[PDB]
Amino acid sequence: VAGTLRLDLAAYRELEAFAQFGSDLDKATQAKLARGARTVEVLKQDLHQPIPVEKQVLIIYALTRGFLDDIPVEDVRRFEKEFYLFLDQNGQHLLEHIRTTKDLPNEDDLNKAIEAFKKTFVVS
Amino acid sequence: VAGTLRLDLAAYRELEAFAQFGSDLDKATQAKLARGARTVEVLKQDLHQPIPVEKQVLIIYALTRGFLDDIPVEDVRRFEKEFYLFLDQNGQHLLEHIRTTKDLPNEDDLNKAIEAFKKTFVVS
Amino acid sequence: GLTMAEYFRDEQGQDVLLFIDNIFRFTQAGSEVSALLGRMPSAVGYQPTLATEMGQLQERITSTAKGSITSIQAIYVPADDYTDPAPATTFSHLDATTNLERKLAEMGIYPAVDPLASTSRALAPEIVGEEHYQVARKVQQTLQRYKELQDIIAILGMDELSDEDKLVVHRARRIQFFLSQNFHVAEQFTGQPGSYVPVKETVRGFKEILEGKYDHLPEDAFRLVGRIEEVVEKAKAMGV
Amino acid sequence: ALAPEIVGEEHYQVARKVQQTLQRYKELQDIIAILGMDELSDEDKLVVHRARRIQFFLSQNFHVAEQFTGQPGSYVPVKETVRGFKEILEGKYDHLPEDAFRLVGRIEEVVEKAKAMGV
Amino acid sequence: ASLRDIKTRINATKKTSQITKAMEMVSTSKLNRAEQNAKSFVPYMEKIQEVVANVALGAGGASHPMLVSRPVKKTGYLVITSDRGLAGAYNSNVLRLVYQTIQKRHASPDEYAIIVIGRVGLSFFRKRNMPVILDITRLPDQPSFADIKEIARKTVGLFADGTFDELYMYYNHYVSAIQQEVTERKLLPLTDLAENKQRTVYEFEPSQEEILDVLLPQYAESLIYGALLDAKASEHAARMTAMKNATDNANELIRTLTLSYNRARQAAITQEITEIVAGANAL
């Protein structure tokens, strides 16, 4: 996931320098800006609260596959918190698979889990 | 012959408004850009091959008196190289007078030589 | 290292390659030695004898009748400052240069060589050949033209640009992504096996693309590819 | 001492938000100076509009300053300060003039000044 | 700060000044070409307004010139704004006037419907809840009659088809090369204008309900070269003046920053010399 995360950050960092002149330049720049903003919101955490590697990789995968592209940029933090709670409560099989084999679960089950969480997530 | 050359190069590039090229604005500036481009092309030189002062005078005079207004930029260099060879065979009296008196030859012969060479020249 | 290479040159009459890890550290050690010995610091604290020590190292790496020694030297540039005395004094001795860029490294383009800053004195029509020189000149011109248009696009949409410059952009994307390659030692980083490309293959592949033979192919098929045929192979693998 | 455990969640949030808006106002200053307030997006318009009033409200009238001015000083409790800054960040006072906020104490004094002068 | 920070800021200011100057030089030609385009339609407009002013005595033989209409069926608003920013107040002033007028006069949402030219206005009316229709996002730099002929036709048809009570219009008037004025205009129904000498209906077919039923839609559609050309002229002038101001401000920043650079580098030199010499002195 980190390989795609790097490019997603770099595109936004390149576009940010010209925001003063050209806005709504094209669909490509609009999508790049939205993805970069959600990336920045994801890469933000408070003091003395460490995160296990499996939860880190799950949230990064969820961001980089586009499941957050329909969430307002102001609510990504609360999305991450509620997603962590949901993963602890129900997706224990995926977490155990990651922790045991150092590899991602099958993308059908992971898509199912993310969709199931999104079906119950409430947006404000 | 140096004043017209200096002024033309100035108009071409010192007025850096002829350098950004965000649009056409070619009504008034087209002639200045054309002769400036021709000036820059004729001012180029190969590795070594220093050319004598009388031939320099001939080529600069031909540039300044509008004789290159119809020669394409891609062929300006080959025009010059053929012009020197034509001079070696036909403008010996012009070169001799320039060498002896440090002055320009009579405008009659000076114009006639270029007029003949232009007809002899092949556009492409 | 230099004397070990000079033995192979002078005695056995071979041809030798020197690979120097970093010259910036050589200059740093020189300045530290001078400061310890007690000499007054020169500009920005370097040793007074920087030029002489550098010349003494770099003069012995030359070719003579019995053999030749070529050397490839990696230089570190502190904080992107090319006016620092160490790079500024190593610039005098070199025959070719190569600027590597963080910006190109981030975009996934290895070996991240800046195609515009990189210069050499072997790029002459009489040395490498007329066709090679023409191709390289056209590549450089198209890349620089693309660079200029990018900031115009950044304030005025590409839908405003003229058709020919849009063609230039289209071809410049292909050229920029074709300059990248996969390496042998890149297996430990990616798993993709490397490649070796001859100079004739390079010049012909760049004569095409520029000619327009691969405009319909997508840009993502050109990255880290090797020979031109592999671009078509990847495009076929993607159905395009 | 600026931690949510010591000062409290509301105080911590309000202080961090004020710092964020002031940083954004600092960031926008160069383009404001070069090509004017005109090109700011509607988001930056609101950012600057809030930030200037916040910066002015940070000023205060001191008791020792009365030997330099005619205004007697003020002592402002922390709860009142938090309430006032939260209200400014909330958008209540978006219509008052900027100079109404200078050298006062509680946020009520701002409205009293905006009633003494103009409306 | 450091020489690094000072020189970085100076370089950024330099690049921005280059961009602004280039934009200005682009805009000058656009202003001149817009003026010489606006010069073209003037005789055609004079001819059509001469004919309509001749027939304007009317004697009531017309529909839409009938002044009154269904009370507050829908108020027509036509606003012309740029499709691209960097113009200063060119879009903001017009949109401000529009919002003031609608909120003070036709406050309820159903009392009105607004027509926009240029994507800035539609972005505005989608940012805030307003009933936008017939939006167009792209226009040529030097337009002609046929470019938005259909848009003009439909704007006319919404009042010709009884779906409006009346129609207003808002746009910047190119008062001068650097001075421009926002314009109020009651567009439909039509009102009086200046006079022309011809009064006799010498053309052979003179029926009012035959000449008018067809002349009036086209005279109303004349709004394209009536308004949009001067709107483009005002947009180009606003861009030119704004870029002038931006360049001046950038050069002032450059002079101030160089004035700081001088003291910075001077202190740096003094530090270098002092640090060397004080170490040399004691040993």
TrEMBL record, chains A, B:
<feature type="binding site">
    <location>
        <position position="45"/>
    </location>
    <ligand>
        <name>ATP 2</name>
    </ligand>
</feature>
<comment type="similarity">
    <text>Belongs to the ATPase alpha/beta chains family.</text>
</comment>
<feature type="domain" description="ATP synthase alpha subunit C-terminal">
    <location>
        <begin position="1"/>
        <end position="117"/>
    </location>
</feature>
<feature type="binding site">
    <location>
        <position position="45"/>
    </location>
    <ligand>
        <name>ATP 1</name>
    </ligand>
</feature>
<protein>
    <recommendedName>
        <fullName>ATP synthase subunit alpha</fullName>
    </recommendedName>
</protein>
<comment type="function">
    <text>Produces ATP from ADP in the presence of a proton gradient across the membrane. The alpha chain is a regulatory subunit.</text>
</comment>
<feature type="binding site">
    <location>
        <position position="46"/>
    </location>
    <ligand>
        <name>ATP 1</name>
    </ligand>
</feature>
TrEMBL record, chain C:
<keyword id="KW-0472">Membrane</keyword>
<keyword id="KW-0406">Ion transport</keyword>
<feature type="binding site">
    <location>
        <position position="110"/>
    </location>
    <ligand>
        <name>ADP</name>
    </ligand>
</feature>
<feature type="binding site">
    <location>
        <position position="121"/>
    </location>
    <ligand>
        <name>ATP</name>
    </ligand>
</feature>
<dbReference type="GO" id="GO:0046962">
    <property type="term" value="F:sodium-transporting ATPase activity, rotational mechanism"/>
</dbReference>
<keyword id="KW-0813">Transport</keyword>
<keyword id="KW-0375">Hydrogen ion transport</keyword>
<protein>
    <recommendedName>
        <fullName>ATP synthase subunit beta</fullName>
        <ecNumber>7.1.2.2</ecNumber>
    </recommendedName>
</protein>
<comment type="function">
    <text>Produces ATP from ADP in the presence of a sodium ion gradient across the membrane. The beta chain is the catalytic subunit.</text>
</comment>
<keyword id="KW-1278">Translocase</keyword>
<keyword id="KW-1003">Cell membrane</keyword>
<comment type="similarity">
    <text>Belongs to the ATPase alpha/beta chains family.</text>
</comment>
<dbReference type="GO" id="GO:0005524">
    <property type="term" value="F:ATP binding"/>
</dbReference>
<keyword id="KW-0067">ATP-binding</keyword>
<dbReference type="GO" id="GO:0005886">
    <property type="term" value="C:plasma membrane"/>
</dbReference>
UniProtKB/TrEMBL annotation, chain E:
<keyword id="KW-0066">ATP synthesis</keyword>
<keyword id="KW-1003">Cell membrane</keyword>
<dbReference type="GO" id="GO:0005524">
    <property type="term" value="F:ATP binding"/>
</dbReference>
<keyword id="KW-0139">CF(1)</keyword>
<dbReference type="InterPro" id="IPR000131">
    <property type="entry name" value="ATP_synth_F1_gsu"/>
</dbReference>
<comment type="function">
    <text>Produces ATP from ADP in the presence of a proton gradient across the membrane. The gamma chain is believed to be important in regulating ATPase activity and the flow of protons through the CF(0) complex.</text>
</comment>
<keyword id="KW-0406">Ion transport</keyword>
<dbReference type="GO" id="GO:0045259">
    <property type="term" value="C:proton-transporting ATP synthase complex"/>
</dbReference>
<comment type="subunit">
    <text>F-type ATPases have 2 components, CF(1) - the catalytic core - and CF(0) - the membrane proton channel. CF(1) has five subunits: alpha(3), beta(3), gamma(1), delta(1), epsilon(1). CF(0) has three main subunits: a, b and c.</text>
</comment>
<dbReference type="Pfam" id="PF00231">
    <property type="entry name" value="ATP-synt"/>
</dbReference>
<dbReference type="InterPro" id="IPR023632">
    <property type="entry name" value="ATP_synth_F1_gsu_CS"/>
</dbReference>
<dbReference type="GO" id="GO:0046933">
    <property type="term" value="F:proton-transporting ATP synthase activity, rotational mechanism"/>
</dbReference>
<dbReference type="GO" id="GO:0005886">
    <property type="term" value="C:plasma membrane"/>
</dbReference>
<keyword id="KW-0813">Transport</keyword>
<keyword id="KW-0472">Membrane</keyword>
